[PDB]
Amino acid sequence: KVFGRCELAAAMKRHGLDNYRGYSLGNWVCAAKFESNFNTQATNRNTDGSTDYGILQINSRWWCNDGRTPGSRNLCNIPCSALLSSDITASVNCAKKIVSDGNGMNAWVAWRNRCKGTDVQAWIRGCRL
Ligand SMILES: [Cl-]
Ligand code: NA
C-alpha cells in the first residue's frame, strides 16, 4: 500500500507514535516519506547483506528475521515480511523498540539527514487528526 501523507499521519497517531519518546508526529511522517516514499512494500538491500523492510525501512541485521542475514538478531521477534503489510501495526511496534534503543531517531539515516532540524510540523499541515 502507498499511503497518503495525512492518511499515514492519522494511522501513526492512532498507533501511539505522536510524541512517542518526545518525537512529534511530523518526525515520523518525514522519516517514512524519505525512507520509503510512504510505500509499505519498499525493500532495499545493504552492502553488508542485510535488507531494509517496509515503510520505515527496518533492518534485518538487528530487528527482524528474513532467513538470509547470517548472524543477525531478531529483536522485534517478527519475520521481516510482516513489515511489508498494508497494516502498519508491526512496523510501528518495532519502531518503538528501535527509538527507545539509545540514539533515538538517529537510527534512521534519512531522518538524520533530511528531517532532523527542519520544520517537521509541515508534514502534518492540513491534516484532520
Ligand atoms: Cl531521543
Ligand atoms: Na535478523
Count of individual helical segments: 4
Count of domains:
1
Kindly estimate the percentage of residues that lie in beta strands according to DSSP: 5-15%
Spatial ordering of strands, largest sheet: 1-2-3
Bound molecules: chloride ion, sodium ion
**What profile does the largest beta sheet have?**
3 strands, antiparallel
The gyration radius over C-alpha positions equals: 14 Å
What is the helix/strand order?
A: HHEEEHH
Structural class: mainly alpha
Number of strands: 3
Please name the CATH topology: Lysozyme
CATH architecture: Orthogonal Bundle
Shape: globular
Q: What is the CATH class?
A: Mainly Alpha
The helix fraction, in percent, is 25-40%
Question: First CA to last CA: what distance?
Answer: 20 Å
InterPro entries: Glyco_hydro_22 (IPR001916), Glyco_hydro_22_CS (IPR019799), Glyco_hydro_22_lys (IPR000974), Lysozyme-like_dom_sf (IPR023346)
EC number: 3.2.1.17
Keywords: Allergen, Antimicrobial, Bacteriolytic enzyme, Disulfide bond, Glycosidase, Hydrolase, Secreted, Signal
Function: Lysozymes have primarily a bacteriolytic function; those in tissues and body fluids are associated with the monocyte-macrophage system and enhance the activity of immunoagents. Has bacteriolytic activity against M.luteus.
